Amino acid sequence: HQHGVVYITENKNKTVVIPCLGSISNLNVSLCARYPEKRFVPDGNRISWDSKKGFTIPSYMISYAGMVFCEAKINDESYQSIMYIVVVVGYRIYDVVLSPSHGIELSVGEKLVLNCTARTELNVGIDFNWEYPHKKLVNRSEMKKFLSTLTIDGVTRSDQGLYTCAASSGLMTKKNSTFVRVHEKPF
């Protein structure tokens, strides 16, 4: 058959619900997780199941498992749901900053290397998007760090201008630019 998805929030302890839907009000349902294998059960307090909502459980309890699935045994037969894949994801970007931060004076022929750095929570993925006037790009403690490097090898005088770097967590975005003036070789 198929598989499903269940998203773990940036905030564990918050409850997640697996859409294991039923039809028998009193259905005694469990939830297996992997890997490694564990099985959970409602406790009335935090863990539950609802014919029309499904298995509800604190995301911190299954955050580790790549997959989970409801299960129930009635009569001589046990059946269980489709595999629900756990997706643990974050979206916060603390700050975007590049080096050099301040002003920049250069001259024709020189090389330039600008470093953009993302400071995010954990479980974060970052997409790097730049903005500027033959240019090469490359992408690579309770925090996560990301960095992109732009290089121009033999700058012309028309590389003078604003250089904005943008980092995206997927729902949050942050910029931080610098101006780059260029002149002719001195004397």
């Binding site: 894949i85 756990v86 997706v87 643990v88 994801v89 992408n139 995206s168």
Partner: protein
């Protein structure tokens, strides 16, 4: 207590399975977040009697594995990724 003939055998420079972060092998995919975040690959490993020697692959291959890449609060898709595995290892100088 494991004997020496045991130990010696168990240490031989051969293809051992090892855990690697996908992030290490595929670092260019920053936007993506993988499930599982690490995979097991056969790589040369173990030691050589002479510490002037070194355990090194003599026959690599590429393998393909299925990984769930979720993209920052956007989408999620099964991704086939290629990894390097070591088929033969050997004790060579440095």
């Amino acid at each position: 207590t494991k004997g020496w003939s045991e130990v010696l055998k168990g240490s031989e420079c051969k293809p051992r399975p090892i855990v690697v972060p996908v992030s290490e092998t595929h670092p260019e995919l920053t936007s993506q977040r993988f499930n599982p975040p690490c995979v097991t690959l056969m790589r040369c490993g173990g030691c050589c009697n002479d510490e002037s020697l070194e355990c090194v692959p003599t026959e690599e291959v590429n393998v393909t594995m299925e990984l769930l890449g979720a993209s920052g609060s956007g989408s999620n898709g099964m991704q086939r990724l290629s990894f390097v595995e070591h088929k033969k290892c050997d004790c060579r100088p440095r």
